[PDB]
Amino acid sequence: GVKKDIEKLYEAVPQLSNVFKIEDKIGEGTFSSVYLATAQLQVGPEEKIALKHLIPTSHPIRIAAELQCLTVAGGQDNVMGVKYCFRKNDHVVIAMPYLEHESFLDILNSLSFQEVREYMLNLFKALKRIHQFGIVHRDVKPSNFLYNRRLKKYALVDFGLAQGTHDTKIELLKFVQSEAQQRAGTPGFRAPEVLTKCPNQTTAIDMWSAGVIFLSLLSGRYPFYKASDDLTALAQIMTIRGSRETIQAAKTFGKSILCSKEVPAQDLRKLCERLRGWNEVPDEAYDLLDKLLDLNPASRITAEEALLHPFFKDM
Amino acid sequence: RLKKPFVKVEDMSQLYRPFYLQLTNMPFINYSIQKPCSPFDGYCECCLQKYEDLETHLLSEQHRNFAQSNQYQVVDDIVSKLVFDFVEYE
Numbered sequence: 261g262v263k264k265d266i267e268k269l270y271e272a273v274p275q276l277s278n279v280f281k282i283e284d285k286i287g288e289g290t291f292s293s294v295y296l297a298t299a300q301l302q303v304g305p306e307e308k309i310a311l312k313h314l315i316p317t318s319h320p321i322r323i324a325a326e327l328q329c330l331t332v333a334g335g336q337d338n339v340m341g342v343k344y345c346f347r348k349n350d351h352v353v354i355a356m357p358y359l360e361h362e363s364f365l366d367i368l369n370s371l372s373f374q375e376v377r378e379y380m381l382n383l384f385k386a387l388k389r390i391h392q393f394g395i396v397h398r399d400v401k402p403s404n405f406l407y408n409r410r411l412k413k414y415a416l417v418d419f420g421l422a423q424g425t426h427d428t429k430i431e432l433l434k435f436v437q438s439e440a441q442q443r444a445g446t447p448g449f450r451a452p453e454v455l456t457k458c459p460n461q462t463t464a465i466d467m468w469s470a471g472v473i474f475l476s477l478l479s480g481r482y483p484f485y486k487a488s489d490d491l492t493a494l495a496q497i498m499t500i501r502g503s504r505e506t507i508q509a510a511k512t513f514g515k516s517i518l519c520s521k522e523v524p525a526q527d528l529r530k531l532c533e534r535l536r537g538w539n540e541v542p543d544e545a546y547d548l549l550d551k552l553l554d555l556n557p558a559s560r561i562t563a564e565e566a567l568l569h570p571f572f573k574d575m
Numbered sequence: 576r577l578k579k580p581f582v583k584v585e586d587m588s589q590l591y592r593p594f595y596l597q598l599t600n601m602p603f604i605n606y607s608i609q610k611p612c613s614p615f616d617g618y619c620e621c622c623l624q625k626y627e628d629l630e631t632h633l634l635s636e637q638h639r640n641f642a643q644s645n646q647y648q649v650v651d652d653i654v655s656k657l658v659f660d661f662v663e664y665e
């Protein structure tokens with residue numbers, strides 16, 4: 261089972277044997293698996309470590325890019341850092357500090373309103389950090405934002421899908437080809453300019469994604485947009501934000517959307533309250549949500565703007 | 576022309592193919608379904624080729640050549656910038 265995987269991991273990357281007691285599998289995705297391990301630090305303490313084993317069909321550029329995002333931007337502001345990295349031919353293992361975290365589903369409908377504010381504050385700190393460096397995460401969603409409720413710690417992880425802004429400070433991100441030019445994420449967290457294959461895609465796409473998270477938090481529903489492909493996510497979006505509004509906003513980025521059934525935009529407070537200090541959620545909450553789910557990527561709020569939103573007065 | 580309901584997306588500069596969605600029903604927001612439900616409720620990058628089985632592709636000579644080549648220098652360069660602070664055993 262997992263035992264056979266661990267053994268194959270050791271056999272794939274012999275140096276791990278000299279360093280890690282690999283204890284468990286804690287993650288599996290299309291492009292990597294992640295293990296819980298314990299090691300000894302030269303400085304004294306034993307430390308719990310997350311080992312991300314990347315699939316060996318991965319391009320070395322793609323591998324280096326994720327590693328570089330972690331090296332350069334990580335370690336600070338709720339962005340996961342890297343301790344070390346080990347390779348043996350096509351097998352690369354990235355070693356990170358392990359953060360014990362909740363399941364999003366699990367704590368979803370038990371969080372206090374203050375914990376929601378705090379969660380969103382701390383996510384925007386991480387997005388602020390990565391966006392400074394010109395990193396578009398492209399996969400912002402609760403499984404990639406690790407949350408320890410007890411210690412109140414957070415970490416944005418998984419740069420396996422990252423791309424660079426045209427002026428990215430992460431030199432290697434320039435070699436990741438645009439999906440738009442010719443690795444997809446989860447349709448449900450993808451902004452409309454992404455869903456419609458807009459060639460220009462900016463850090464605003466991550467801000468939409470944090471808007472989708474906030475929406476799950478305010479409504480008590482996750483996954484909010486359950487879709488197996490991009491246009492299904494788009495049809496669902498038009499149901500929330502209105503099809504006229506979406507068709508209008510898509511023109512401003514070069515896309516023409518035809519929808520046969522006109523649906524109206526929902527008031528965000530009503531939608532969330534019908535779905536769901538929860539007795540006095542301030543207007544500012546729904547106001548921030550509206551700015552994150554701005555269908556126009558140019559006017560959509562930025563991460564440093566969000567942190568200055570009155571929703572976060574005074575933290 | 577198109578059977579309803581549909582969504583159609585096209586690029587105003589024709590730099591893209593038109594794409595479509597046709598469903599039986601448009602999504603409808605269901606407030607009645609219970610929390611926490613939705614209200615709406617490989618290929619090798621190194622060898623640039625599709626495969627039917629991973630474990631055998633990893634053993635193929637094409638892949639095994641790549642795996643042992645210089646192409647991971649880009650990774651090693653970053654790796655030789657990080658500080659190793661674990662205790663290593665013989």
Ligand SMILES: Nc1ncnc2c1ncn2[C@@H]1O[C@H](COP(=O)(O)OP(=O)(O)O)[C@@H](O)[C@H]1O
Nearest residue numbers: 286287288289292294310356357358359403418
């Ligand atoms: N540094 C970490 N500490 C604790 N758990 C982690 C860490 N990194 C990843 N995990 C767990 O492993 C999962 C997979 O890691 P991720 O980097 O998202 O790769 P992928 O989505 O490609 O599997 C995460 O969703 C998380 O639950």
Ligand SMILES: [Mg+2]
Nearest residue numbers: 289403404418
């Ligand atoms: Mg992930």
Ligand SMILES: [Zn+2]
Nearest residue numbers: 619621622638
């Ligand atoms: Zn291959």
